[PDB]
Symmetry: C2
Subunit: 331 residues, 2 copies
């Protein structure tokens, strides 16, 4: 999950004047894609859309669209909207599963209207998503690419679940997970923006590696924030993760330093006491799990930036580098 919000980041779009209009306009288009008869739930979804801007994934999509001229603006707005609607559908379901009270400062659907309606609201967003996908293109490979992405995300979520409480979790298994659960929508955004615009092969062939690298680093930075600072201190989400068997990157990297000591604590699962939690954090600090996670996030970040520096020179290249350095805190 993504527990941390970046201050430097919707107002973030002011620094990107060439795509702020598209994103501002997409926001309005987004408000009209959702036509639903149950007016109370329709209003709630609108409220989720209204209250949360940022539109990070549509941003990367629109930036990548600049490398080509083959796209109609109707296609691009539908392509960007598809990505964001899928994203929001998956958030609605995540919040049911986490029973989160609020999202984007809005009370979640299941709180006011119950779990069934919340689940069906997500499902309805999937139909809106596929409708927007079709509007965006008649290219069968690009539609399949969307479907395949939607599939990898769901597999990402299922494999993360299979992995709960596994103290033999590997870096390979972590990458394959945060690739699916997090990075895949970034890859999809970059690839579809560029493809839809018929950008040059050289660009197309880099989009997925860029999106994957960014999305991985992005998930790692959130994990790093879970264990950073004072090990005596505690964060609710982190406390809930450990009881639920979710070992994020700094812990994952620390396990092998003292598997029996971590196991004495982790095995208590939901029964883990607050003292237990702090002891876990003290071991992560002792073995510098955070410094290890940081080197990996930095290498993934630099891989993204290196690939971005190989794109065609110009405003979009420069905007992509600036956006990535900002998102991944590497200014």
């Amino acid at each position: 999950a993504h527990h941390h919000h970046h201050h430097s980041l919707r107002q973030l779009w002011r620094q990107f004047p060439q795509v702020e209009p598209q994103l501002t306009a997409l926001q309005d288009y987004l408000l009209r894609t959702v036509q639903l008869d149950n007016q109370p739930i329709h209003h709630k979804i609108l409220a989720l859309l209204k209250s949360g801007g940022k539109l990070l994934r549509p941003g990367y999509f629109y930036l990548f669209s600049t490398f080509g001229n083959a796209a109609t603006p109707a296609q691009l707005q539908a392509g960007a909207a598809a990505i964001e609607i899928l994203h929001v559908g998956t958030l609605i379901h995540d919040d049911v599963i986490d029973d989160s009270p609020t999202r984007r400062g809005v009370r979640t659907i299941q709180m006011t209207y119950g779990q069934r309606n919340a689940i069906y609201a997500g499902d309805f967003m999937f139909t809106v998503y596929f409708d927007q996908v079709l509007k965006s293109t008649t290219d069968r490979s690009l539609i399949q690419n969307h479907i395949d992405a939607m599939h990898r995300i769901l597999q990402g979520e299922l494999h993360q679940m299979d992995l709960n409480y596994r103290e033999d979790i590997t870096l390979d298994a972590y990458l394959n997970e945060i690739a699916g659960k997090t990075a895949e929508l970034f890859a999809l955004s970059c690839y579809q923006g560029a493809q839809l615009a018929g950008a040059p092969q050289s660009v197309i062939d880099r989009t997925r590696d860029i999106g994957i690298a960014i999305g991985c680093a992005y998930q790692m930075l959130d994990d790093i924030l879970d264990y950073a600072g004072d090990p005596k201190r505690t964060q609710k989400p982190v406390l809930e993760d450990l009881r639920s068997g979710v070992y994020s990157l700094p812990l994952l990297l620390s396990l092998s330093h003292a598997p029996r000591d971590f196991h004495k604590l982790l095995k208590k699962k939901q029964a883990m006491t607050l003292e237990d939690i702090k002891h876990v954090q003290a071991l992560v600090a002792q073995y510098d799990g955070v410094g290890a996670a940081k080197q990996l996030a930095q290498d993934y970040t630099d891989r993204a930036l290196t690939l971005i520096q190989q794109l065609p020179v110009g405003s979009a290249q420069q905007s992509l580098e600036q956006l990535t350095r900002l998102l991944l805190r590497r200014d």
Copy 2:
């Protein structure tokens, strides 16, 4: 309706046999608790009824490959199963229903695409799923309503169930490239069948031996779900029903026996059967308008079997 049903329809038996195995392979999954959510619906209950209508209608055409047809038929059963799993939601197992459902929707779209390069047939699927989910989102509002009209029930209860039946007949004929004559009748046929089918199930809530009915009916009533024979009985004694139904989740076994007793007194089952019979008759009449031959005869036999008009 033994799960051996398709033995009586040999011209589609090889495709229905191949579909069952294709479906199983298609929905394979690591997580067992989630897989089992799925596997339960693929192994129990009615066997490939909607795909049966799909394939019978496909024998009017030869435009699609067997692989395309098979993805078309799978998509309908997958959507059916996806919605059934989510309809179960009310909890670690609840993680399971949600993800199992979501998994089915992603396989759904994949199969839809695999079935056709025709954009309007793809849109036809999305629109159907849209209507179904919109319908699901109206339910909370209908529950506990004792002023519900027959019109609302038909639109919101029978009509929703009808969607997958209409979708089946329509896509089977369209993908195979049946003549327009046939295509033009498919939705009217599937809607009448699907509505009759839902009504018959409702009839069984109150006409079936109480040996096993009152269990799930007790749950429906506590939840504010009033099936056709109850709906059609309310007007004969609105206050006497209200007195029981207003206890909602607090309703007892004696309160449900009482509701059941009043439905029998006021002939809700008889009223429901007469209306169901109109829809069944209509279905059979429309099927008798199709070109004469093997597909027509089989569609008739299947429909008479399903709607107990044999």
